[PDB]
Amino acid sequence: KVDLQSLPTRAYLDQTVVPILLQGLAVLAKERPPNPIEFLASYLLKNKAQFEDRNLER
Amino acid sequence: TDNVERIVENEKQKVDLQSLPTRAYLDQTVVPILLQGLAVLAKERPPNPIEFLASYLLKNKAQFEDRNLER
Amino acid sequence: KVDLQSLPTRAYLDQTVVPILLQGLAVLAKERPPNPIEFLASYLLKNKAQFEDRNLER
Amino acid sequence: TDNVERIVENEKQKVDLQSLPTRAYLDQTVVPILLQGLAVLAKERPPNPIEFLASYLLKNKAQFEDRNLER
């Protein structure tokens, strides 16, 4: 009975944050804003709804 | 084999964050705090991982921001 | 707790020497001096102060 | 895919270091010793990396200098 808690580290990350990070990092590299960490963190929060629970968690 | 990375590509004067190649730009700005946050996230495995990672960035931004090519 | 010593190879180099090298290599390619290795090494030493510790080391 | 590089650009007679295209010039002069030095630097991770790399160049210049289109 595998779930998010039991997955290997890389699989866990690939299931949860890797897709939104890939998108966000690509946007960040294009924009190059004055506050990149804040920008990325903001990006995650703004776009969370489109990426959240699209994984084993269902 | 790994420490071989063509930067002769990007060079083909004054270098700042805006002019850095993509990988260098990211490595200068977010990769350190991301590496730390992703490690914390993988260990905790919280119910809201995207939110948690974003919170981690915000909470630890002060220790990582401006520690790069633009002081 | 990440620091310079713990960074992946490329991130380490990007944090420490890549920016000054980019600038120096561009100057070297423009000047084409009789002693290019010496010129580049000299460039690094002369401009070190403007690039040194502008990274995680702080 | 990678071994495809237009030099028909640069050709459009006697070739020396001064007339080489930028990438070729760098590859002829500093890329070898830089590749070696960057590898040594990444493995050691010293307190003064720019200084260390410059020192590496100076110390090993004799094994790399003039091993190119101009003997």
Curated annotation (Swiss-Prot), chains A, C:
Family affiliation: Belongs to the dpy-30 family.
Protein purpose: As part of the MLL1/MLL complex, involved in the methylation of histone H3 at 'Lys-4', particularly trimethylation. Histone H3 'Lys-4' methylation represents a specific tag for epigenetic transcriptional activation. May play some role in histone H3 acetylation. In a teratocarcinoma cell, plays a crucial role in retinoic acid-induced differentiation along the neural lineage, regulating gene induction and H3 'Lys-4' methylation at key developmental loci. May also play an indirect or direct role in endosomal transport.
A GO CC annotation given for this chain: histone methyltransferase complex
Disulfide bonds: none
Biological process per Gene Ontology, one example term: endosomal transport
Signal peptide: none
Gene Ontology molecular function: any one: protein homodimerization activity
Name by which UniProt lists this protein: Protein dpy-30 homolog
Places the protein is found: Nucleus; Golgi apparatus, trans-Golgi network
Domain of life: Eukaryota
Portion of the full sequence shown: 45 to 99 of 99
The protein's assembly and partners: Homodimer. Core component of several methyltransferase-containing complexes including MLL1/MLL, MLL2/3 (also named ASCOM complex) and MLL4/WBP7. Each complex is at least composed of ASH2L, RBBP5, WDR5, DPY30, one or more specific histone methyltransferases (KMT2A/MLL1, KMT2D/MLL2, KMT2C/MLL3 and KMT2B/MLL4), and the facultative components MEN1, HCFC1, HCFC2, NCOA6, KDM6A, PAXIP1/PTIP, PAGR1 and alpha- and beta-tubulin. Interacts with ASH2L; the interaction is direct. Interacts with ARFGEF1.
Keywords: Acetylation, Chromatin regulator, Golgi apparatus, Isopeptide bond, Nucleus, Phosphoprotein, Transcription, Transcription regulation, Ubl conjugation
Name of the gene: DPY30
First-listed, main subcellular location of the protein, grouped into a coarse class: nucleus
